[PDB]
Design a protein around this ligand. Sequence first.
Ligand SMILES: CC(=O)c1ccc2c(c1)N(CCCN(C)C)c1ccccc1S2
Length: 182
Amino acid sequence: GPMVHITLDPDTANPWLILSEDRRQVRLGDTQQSIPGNEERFDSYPMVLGAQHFHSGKHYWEVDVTGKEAWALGVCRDSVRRKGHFLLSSKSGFWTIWLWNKQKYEAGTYPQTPLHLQVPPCQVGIFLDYEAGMVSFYNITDHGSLIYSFSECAFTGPLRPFFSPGFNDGGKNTAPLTLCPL
Ligand SMILES: CC(=O)c1ccc2c(c1)N(CCCN(C)C)c1ccccc1S2
């Protein structure tokens, strides 16, 4: 079935992130870690990928976001640029939604799409359908209602799970993103 056990890829993790020993959780740090400047590491935002690669098929996983004032989740091409600033956009190889400022939910279309959520999600489900060209986001707290779906994605190559526990703000928002047991 589509449920997949995601683990986080340490080689991609921005130095402002702290990964748990089992690589199932990630949070913002108060200072940057001193770690290699390898080509796969996001250097400008607190972002990290899952280790898993998807070339085809249906895949599903869930993330706990309880109480966080900001986070971003989704899928991206493995080929996305890792160094420098960029637009989180489905024109740039990312299919993502996010929260910031405690109550501003947006989908990473270009331009961005505001999302009106009646129930703030505590857990989010991410469903990837490679052949259908779809990435769908579900509000587990609201009985699995649809938050947003990207369609007509027309994927090539491997895709990766994408995560951010927030941006750097002054040590705020330090609770982790946690991959839920499935
Ligand atoms: C849209 C875009 O390219 C974009 C690029 C990077 C980031 C981002 C938006 N925001 C949303 C804006 C935060 N700014 C205003 C500080 C975000 C949200 C949750 C977690 C991490 C991040 S960092």
